[PDB]
Amino acid sequence: GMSAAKNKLEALKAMTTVVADTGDIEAIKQFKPVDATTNPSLILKAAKLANYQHLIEEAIDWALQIKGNKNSQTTLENVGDKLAVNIGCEVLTSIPGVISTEVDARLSFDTQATVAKARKLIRLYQDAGIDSDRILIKIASTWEGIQAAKILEAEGIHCNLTLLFHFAQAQACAEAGTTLISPFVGRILDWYKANSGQSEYSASEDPGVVSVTEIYNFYKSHGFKTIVMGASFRNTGEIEELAGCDRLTISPELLAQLEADTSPLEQKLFPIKETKDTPELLTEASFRWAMNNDPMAHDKLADGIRRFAADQVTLESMLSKKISQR
Amino acid sequence: GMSAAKNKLEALKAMTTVVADTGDIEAIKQFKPVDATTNPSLILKAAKLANYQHLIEEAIDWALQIKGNKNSQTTLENVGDKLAVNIGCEVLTSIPGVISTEVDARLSFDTQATVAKARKLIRLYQDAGIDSDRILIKIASTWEGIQAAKILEAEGIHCNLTLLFHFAQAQACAEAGTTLISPFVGRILDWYKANSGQSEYSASEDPGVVSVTEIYNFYKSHGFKTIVMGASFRNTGEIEELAGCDRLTISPELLAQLEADTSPLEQKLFPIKETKDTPELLTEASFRWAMNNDPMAHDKLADGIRRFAADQVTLESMLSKKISQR
Numbered sequence: 256g257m258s259a260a261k262n263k264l265e266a267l268k269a270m271t272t273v274v275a276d277t278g279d280i281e282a283i284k285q286f287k288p289v290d291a292t293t294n295p296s297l298i299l300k301a302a303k304l305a306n307y308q309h310l311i312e313e314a315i316d317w318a319l320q321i322k323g324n325k326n327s328q329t330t331l332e333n334v335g336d337k338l339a340v341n342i343g344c345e346v347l348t349s350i351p352g353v354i355s356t357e358v359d360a361r362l363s364f365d366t367q368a369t370v371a372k373a374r375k376l377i378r379l380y381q382d383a384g385i386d387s388d389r390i391l392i393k394i395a396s397t398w399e400g401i402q403a404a405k406i407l408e409a410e411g412i413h414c415n416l417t418l419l420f421h422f423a424q425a426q427a428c429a430e431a432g433t434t435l436i437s438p439f440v441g442r443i444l445d446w447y448k449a450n451s452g453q454s455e456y457s458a459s460e461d462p463g464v465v466s467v468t469e470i471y472n473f474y475k476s477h478g479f480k481t482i483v484m485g486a487s488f489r490n491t492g493e494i495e496e497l498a499g500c501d502r503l504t505i506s507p508e509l510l511a512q513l514e515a516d517t518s519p520l521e522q523k524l525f526p527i528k529e530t531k532d533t534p535e536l537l538t539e540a541s542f543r544w545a546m547n548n549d550p551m552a553h554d555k556l557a558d559g560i561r562r563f564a565a566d567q568v569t570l571e572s573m574l575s576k577k578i579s580q581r
Numbered sequence: 582g583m584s585a586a587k588n589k590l591e592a593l594k595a596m597t598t599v600v601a602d603t604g605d606i607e608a609i610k611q612f613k614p615v616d617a618t619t620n621p622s623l624i625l626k627a628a629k630l631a632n633y634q635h636l637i638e639e640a641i642d643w644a645l646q647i648k649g650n651k652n653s654q655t656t657l658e659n660v661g662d663k664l665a666v667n668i669g670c671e672v673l674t675s676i677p678g679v680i681s682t683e684v685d686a687r688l689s690f691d692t693q694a695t696v697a698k699a700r701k702l703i704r705l706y707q708d709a710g711i712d713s714d715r716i717l718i719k720i721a722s723t724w725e726g727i728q729a730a731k732i733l734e735a736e737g738i739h740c741n742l743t744l745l746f747h748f749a750q751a752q753a754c755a756e757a758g759t760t761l762i763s764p765f766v767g768r769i770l771d772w773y774k775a776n777s778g779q780s781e782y783s784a785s786e787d788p789g790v791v792s793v794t795e796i797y798n799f800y801k802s803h804g805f806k807t808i809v810m811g812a813s814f815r816n817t818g819e820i821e822e823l824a825g826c827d828r829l830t831i832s833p834e835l836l837a838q839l840e841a842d843t844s845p846l847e848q849k850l851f852p853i854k855e856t857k858d859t860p861e862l863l864t865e866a867s868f869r870w871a872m873n874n875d876p877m878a879h880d881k882l883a884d885g886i887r888r889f890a891a892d893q894v895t896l897e898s899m900l901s902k903k904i905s906q907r
Binding site: 256257422457459460465469472473475476477521522525526527528530531532533534535 | 853
């Protein structure tokens with residue numbers, strides 16, 4: 256009784272809820288995760304799949320057949336959402352748990368627009384015959400996005416707060432009653448490698464791992480209920496260094512790697528007891544200072560937002576063509 | 582509510598029972614720890630103190646006045662023990678907690694001789710008017726020394742199992758009902774630096790820290806009651822990387838350093854929940870293989886034993902002179 260095997264994928268599945276970071280059933284079928292996650296990039300990617308081409312149409316159909324009478328932008332944005340939901344719908348058939356679908360990132364600094372879109376996406380899922388509880392609406396972790404999550408969570412729409420790079424986002428998310436957070440580990444790494452002069456890190460010193468660890472400890476030791484889900488890893492090293500965590504979402508590439516590795520897997524994160532009083536509320540002004548004060552988190556949020564919004568438009572360009580071919 | 586300050590010494594005192602690794606009241610008075618620890622080296626060292634010279638006599642006196650009628654070895658070994666106890670006695674006056682006094686390390690591979698000596702040392706403390714519960718008898722963590730600790734602990738003599746370098750020693754100690762273990766962190770470091778080709782380590786990758794962490798987690802997650810007390814540090818980095826631990830014993834040099842540092846101190850070790858079943862008993866044969874199989878722990882135990890036994894004889898040489906001057 257030191258660890259208890261088979262291989263690392265199987266091993267991890269026993270101390271941590273494993274989640275596939277992909278839009279593609281093929282990967283889900285092969286790895287049999289309990290949740291899955293997508294995002295604008297992964298949706299763009301999945302949309303390029305041959306077997307998924309049918310889903311683009313069924314989206315335009317729905318968009319059109321519902322919308323008998325055309326707003327070249329408004330109507331594009333309805334096909335966009337439907338496609339994401341269709342793709343979610345497909346993965347859902349093959350997983351026992353939950354799906355994470357992300358709102359249009361262009362909405363990131365606008366709380367009300369964000370909540371509108373979340374309810375929208377939920378409704379679209381209800382239409383497809385899916386209980387809202389099978390769903391996590393993913394929102395970039397800006398102040399505004401967290402305020403959104405507050406409102407939604409208060410009426411039982413569950414949120415995945417993503418692009419999380421910092422303690423301050425963590426505290427705020429939790430203070431607002433968020434269901435889950437998805438800190439972007441690999442990206443914290445990327446930033447430090449490209450900016451620090453240290454440019455080799457090991458699992459322990461990996462600043463993403465260090466960050467997600469502080470947060471995890473803070474959550475459990477303070478009784479906060481928000482699920483902690485590491486995401487967006489550069490390597491197995493980091494995933495391993497987090498083994499024990501509530502959940503972890505993992506690329507099919509890294510997923511394959513884990514399954515192929517037969518070495519034993521030491522648990523690193525543990526159930527910790529609640530022993531500290533819930534702390535002073537983190538104010539907007541304090542949040543914003545914290546966040547401006549940390550170069551890497553300041554950079555990496557903005558950039559992930561830029562990147563995801565960009566992928567929204569390139570996704571839209573491609574949908575526009577299919578649009579005009581009628 | 583992130584951390585809650587004053588300086589690092591004071592900070593650590595709040596998440597961890599702080600212990601001074603020294604024989605000298607001057608250091609105890611200055612740092613006001615709750616426990617203290619000594620060992621053959623520290624006793625040899627303390628014995629060189631001017632203000633302590635009186636204690637060497639009072640030891641020879643007692644040895645002689647009790648022993649009206651001289652065995653040149655046997656009688657030396659009685660003055661030895663008394664001196665350690667006298668020195669413990671002195672530190673005890675200035676600490677609210679417990680003292681750790683180590684048996685003659687030459688006894689390390691002999692269980693019965695060891696238990697005899699422990700009871701002896703306890704009795705000597707009772708004579709000085711001290712409840713046995715104020716005392717931790719320190720024993721090298723060989724199989725034999727652990728078997729000793731079993732016997733003693735079963736009759737309520739409490740043990741500090743020291744020179745701990747490995748998981749296997751940890752499991753065995755705990756399975757035998759040991760009160761406390763003192764893993765030698767700095768020494769694990771020393772070994773790796775001198776043997777691995779990696780020769781810079783940071784707090785996270787420090788193999789001592791890594792080891793003591795695995796153990797700590799194993800203890801708490803498995804319900805075992807043995808106190809974990811990191812010891813014998815090369816630097817503040819390691820002590821910090823362990824902040825939260827049950828206790829930590831620390832040199833006055835490192836103690837000074839901690840007090841002088843005003844940066845905030847993040848807690849790293851937390852109260853973890855008991856969730857796993859007590860594991861299969863670790864057999865002698867399995868212990869001995871584990872231990873032979875790990876170059877560093879195999880080296881470092883033997884060597885710490887050699888070193889401590891050596892310090893016993895050099896301590897004795899010096900006592901022999903004071904002996905013959907009558």
